Design a binder for these strands. Structure first.
Lengths: 141, 61, 129, 149, 73
RNA sequence: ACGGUCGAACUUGACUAUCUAGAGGAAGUAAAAGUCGGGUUUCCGUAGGUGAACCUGCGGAAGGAUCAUUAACGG
RNA sequence: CAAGACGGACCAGAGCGAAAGCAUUUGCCAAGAAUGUUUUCAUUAAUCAAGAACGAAAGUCGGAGGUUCGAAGACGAUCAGAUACCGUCGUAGUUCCGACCAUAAACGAUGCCGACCGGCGAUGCGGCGGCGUUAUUCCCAUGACCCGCCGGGCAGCUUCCGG
RNA sequence: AAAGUUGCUGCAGUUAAAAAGCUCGUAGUUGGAUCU
RNA sequence: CGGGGAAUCAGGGUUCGAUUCCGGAGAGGGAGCCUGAGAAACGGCUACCACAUCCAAGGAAGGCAGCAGGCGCGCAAAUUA
């Protein structure tokens, strides 16, 4: 098993660091390939311009059409499929508009029903979808 | 070559016949390696063109 | 090969106590081992013992009483400062009330409770409870 | 457990508890020494001498009788060999194996054995350099193997 | 000892790692000026050195006294 | 102003790294109901059989369901 | 009469080898374990990144050789759809020599060295102690059996040790 | 932090992911008693 | 940028420390200077490259990673008091 000597520090620490790379989390965090392939790129939110409305078909047993929005980010130019949350919130979003997109919750997993969609729309033209649904604010254009 | 080796065949006759089969196999595994790279190059580009659809160009509107 | 005879001794006595045997033959003997066993005896954990003088490294026959639960060794012999002794008797010993960590100091092979009295800390050896 | 062998033997000698010279043995230490000397001039290793003293003369352990061991007596008088006895034997063995190898090429097992022998020799050499019996420049060589024996 | 009037010594020490409670064997080589009054110095022997004003690009120390190797007479 | 020195910078090719236009190529993607239409126990490594699979040859494995018989042996 | 091939049955939970593996007789060549030792040396050791030997089968070069078998392949049979199964033949190979290659479920799917923790008798090797029986009653020792005991082996049975 | 799911304290490697084909071996680590 | 430190935590640890204290470094990029005790200083100068204002077409003036404030950038940050 383990070397349990008194002069074995260098063996130990080196072994630890060597084995640390096999951890999925650590590697994801420290290799800097996931930080570069991430469209947000170490960002809480991003802001993009909507290109088209996309009706993404839901993953098998739950049968529906999840209404997404194909944004193109401003800060680099990557394309993203972003799910528009509450019902009838797709109607607020129009083509060629500023949209604040955020993560879904799982750091890069497709959340639940929607396949290959990691992002959700939070704001449309600097007003929140949460407000627009509840009828608290008006959307400018 | 599909010739049964008769007993009366000696050196130069047997030796050239064996060297012909060696050259057939050498031509064969070059041809097999070429196909192994052809399928590998075609699978990898079709893997991209299928994974391209997952990200974009799949929906409704 | 046999590294650290004390460890061997402690395992041997330990097994012979879990089995509930009356006497144990432990070999080889060392002065460290003898001191350890003496210490153990002093707290009524073992009983008396005979050191068979073979002209080699001797053998010890130890009388056993069912009073011992676990006799363990810690190797390597870590250097234990008097500041850090509290962390050891929190890790190794089953209660604050009983059990002893044996450590070797310049003042001699002794318990942690005696170390505290004599103010000296040293390299850890074993523990018994 | 042996060094190179997988086997775990227990075949060894065990000296008695008594260290004092037995009552029947009416030999002086000087006499024993003389005997040793007169055996060594025939050309023997210390081991052989010891064996001889055990079998025929009834000398159990010479280090009990004289106080010094055989090789110290030999060293002290000056009839001791240059390279250590065991090491020499190992070298001889190695040489023999090499000879066999050169006679017959295909013997893989023999080669393997030779490798092991060489390793042993190296080990012993190292030890003897640490204890300053061999010169530090000394080295076992492939061609300069049979020259030492 | 292959430089003119200067030798290369090495200091071995044990560096402590707090995480593991263990040590590691670390060494540092020094270029150190040897005075020709300490002649017939062999390799592998203990030398006491003293800090001095920087003598070369790397030499800062200067041999003060040599005590011979353990096995050597 | 000669010379020295420090020396920004430019030009010339070589290896490179990037940024951004692009005839054409090969694709893929929604539209057209448009025209035609039985075998296998499970494997391993290798070689061949059209790439893989699978099959076979060679050498391994079981990670595969042991019934029964078994006292003399001398004139 | 010749040629290559292979060494059965004896062949075992028997042995040896680091593993891969290893079986006709005799001779030669060097090793090797275990055992016995009141022999010698006196820590010379344990495990080991770098590195280095050996490493089934298959395959690859170079020569030699082709008995059987045999991937390939060719025929023959077999059917809504048969192109694997089966049969005959049969190339490389399988055989040896000299180089390569370095992988196998290379298996105990169980690192190595060391200590401790129940029991039992069968076996193999060596040794020790024994009343006897046998070599046509042997003339002394020696062999072959039989009862024990020791050490190292390959195994086994049993056990509510503990896991 | 929960994560004794990076384990020094404190994980595992028969069947669950895992022990190199085997041996030698340079560094490293580790090394039997024994001197008031 | 490095420390002093911060966050979390039984014990061990893991992560953060551009941020007001100390030390370091640079004032668009590089390079070279003068004065001075002290500067290779930029709220000094001298060049070249990159930017860039006023021009009567000859020339002149630049340097907010100071305090406000602006643009740009962005998910992301205050008053020309």
């Amino acid at each position: 098993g383990k070397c349990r000597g008194l002069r074995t520090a260098r063996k130990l620490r080196s072994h630890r660091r060597d084995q640390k790379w096999h951890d999925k989390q650590y590697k994801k965090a420290h290799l800097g390939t996931a930080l570069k392939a991430n469209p947000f790129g170490g960002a809480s939110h991003a802001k993009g311009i909507v290109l088209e409305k996309v009706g993404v078909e839901a993953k098998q047993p739950n049968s529906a059409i999840r209404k997404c929005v194909r944004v193109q980010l401003i800060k680099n130019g990557k394309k993203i499929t972003a799910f528009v949350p509450n019902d009838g919130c797709l109607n607020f979003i129009e083509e060629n508009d500023e949209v604040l997109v955020a993560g879904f919750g799982r750091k890069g997993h497709a959340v639940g029903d929607i396949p290959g969609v990691r992002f959700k729309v939070v704001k449309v033209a600097n007003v929140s979808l949460l407000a627009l649904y509840k009828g608290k604010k008006e959307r400018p254009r | 070559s599909t010739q049964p080796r008769s007993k009366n065949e000696s050196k130069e006759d047997k030796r050239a016949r064996k060297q012909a089969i060696k050259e057939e196999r050498k031509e064969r595994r070059v041809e097999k390696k070429a196909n192994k790279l052809a399928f590998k190059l075609e699978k990898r580009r079709q893997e991209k063109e299928l994974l391209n659809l997952k990200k974009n160009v799949e929906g409704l509107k | 090969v046999r590294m650290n005879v004390l460890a061997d001794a402690l395992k041997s006595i330990n097994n012979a106590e879990k089995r509930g045997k009356r006497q144990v033959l432990i070999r080889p003997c060392s002065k460290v081992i003898v001191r350890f066993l003496t210490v153990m005896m002093k707290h009524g954990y073992i009983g008396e013992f005979e050191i068979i003088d073979d002209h080699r490294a001797g053998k010890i026959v130890v009388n056993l009483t069912g009073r011992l639960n676990k006799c363990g060794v810690i190797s390597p012999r870590f250097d234990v400062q008097l500041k850090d002794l509290e962390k050891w008797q929190n890790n190794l010993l089953p209660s604050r009330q009983f059990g002893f960590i044996v450590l070797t100091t310049s003042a001699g092979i002794m318990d942690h409770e005696e170390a505290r009295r004599k103010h000296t800390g040293g390299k850890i050896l074993g523990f018994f409870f | 457990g042996r060094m190179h062998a997988p086997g775990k033997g227990l075949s060894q000698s065990a000296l008695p508890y008594r260290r004092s010279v037995p009552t029947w043995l009416k030999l002086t230490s000087d006499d024993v020494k003389e005997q040793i000397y007169k055996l060594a001039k025939k050309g023997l290793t210390p081991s052989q001498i010891g064996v001889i003293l055990r079998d025929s003369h009834g000398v159990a352990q010479v280090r009990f009788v004289t106080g010094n061991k055989i090789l110290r007596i030999l060293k002290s008088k000056g009839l001791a060999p240059d390279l250590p006895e065991d090491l020499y034997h190992l070298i001889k063995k190695a040489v023999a194996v090499r000879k066999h190898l050169e006679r017959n090429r295909k013997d893989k097992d023999a080669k393997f054995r030779l490798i092991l022998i060489e390793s042993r020799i190296h080990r012993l050499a190292r030890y003897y350099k640490t204890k300053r019996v061999l010169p530090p420049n000394w080295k076992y060589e492939s061609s300069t193997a049979s020259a030492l024996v | 000892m292959k430089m003119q009037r200067t030798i290369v010594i090495r200091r071995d020490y044990l560096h402590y790692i707090r995480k593991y409670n263990r040590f590691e064997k670390r060494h540092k080589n020094m270029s150190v000026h040897l005075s020709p009054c300490f002649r017939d110095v062999q390799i592998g022997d203990i030398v006491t050195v003293g800090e001095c004003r920087p003598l070369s690009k790397t030499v800062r120390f200067n041999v003060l006294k040599v005590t011979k190797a353990a096995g050597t007479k």
